[PDB]
């Protein structure tokens with residue numbers, strides 16, 4: 001069946017230890033070197049704190065991992081090891097445990113994040129190009145390392161808008177890509193789930209992340225965040241189909257032999273494919289260009305195999321102004 005157009009065999013070409021995360025044995029340092037200063041957030045798998053390393057005064061973030069099999073912990077740790085030094089990937093400083101309870105935690109570099117809801121209403125055209133280019137560097141890097149992030153969304157994209165620093169965080173849903181492998185579709189935030197997930201197509205690849213990135217680009221240039229605002233996973237696909245079109249959805253399903261859950265029959269309706277220019281109005285016109293729309297059109301495609309790769313996206317004319325500034 002389906003495979004990635006890029007980096008398809010890269011894990012098969014590496015040593016097994018690279019991708020056999022169940023066999024990984026982390027070295028767990030001592031969490032007692034860190035003083036927790038403030039809670040930043042919590043989710044189903046972790047709680048995150050700002051902290052200080054008392055031995056060297058470094059400000060960090062500590063992600064204390066909630067009870068889960070050690071398998072998911074080893075996965076995230078091994079992925080982060082493999083991504084060491086990757087451009088715009090959050091830096092893992094250490095893997096530590098409370099030395100009595102043995103509860104594990106991950107220590108990351110600090111980023112002075114600007115809350116994205118505030119940020120995404122004040123970005124300039126050049127800012128959007130710049131930050132999308134920076135995020136693409138992280139995705140091209142992880143994809144080249146054989147890893148799908150599977151949870152790309154604004155929260156997971158820390159941006160320090162003063163220092164112009166971007167980091168892709170929270171690798172707890174990330175997996176290794178292996179050709180023909182069937183993956184769990186219960187990944188990503190609703191609003192950033194690709195159509196493949198919503199139609200229960202398990203043989204997905206790095207291109208899932210490119211759908212999510214496209215959703216972010218749409219939200220930035222159009223100032224509608226999130227761009228596709230489903231009420232549940234079923235409605236999420238309806239929201240997509242009202243833009244990309246229903247006949248076009250059916251062509252995708254037919255190509256990949258995808259079985260459609262019959263609950264969709266009652267809710268998808270009939271929708272023409274919309275022109276991306278339909279989303280332009282006076283509040284967003286200064287962020288939208290022909291180049292932006294061309295790029296977006298090539299990301300927000302049903303057919304995962306037809307989406308741009310991260311590299312192809314980086315190579316698009318939309319980013320020429322950014323490349324020129326960075327050269």
Ligand SMILES: O=C(O)c1ccc(Nc2nc(-c3ccc(Cl)cc3)cs2)cc1O
Nearest residue numbers: 040048061063108111112113169170171
């Ligand atoms: O899972 C992960 O790998 C993970 C990694 C890092 C991380 N860092 C965060 N930084 C903040 C923050 C917000 C506002 C200010 Cl002012 C400063 C920091 C929020 S979250 C969170 C993580 O969940």
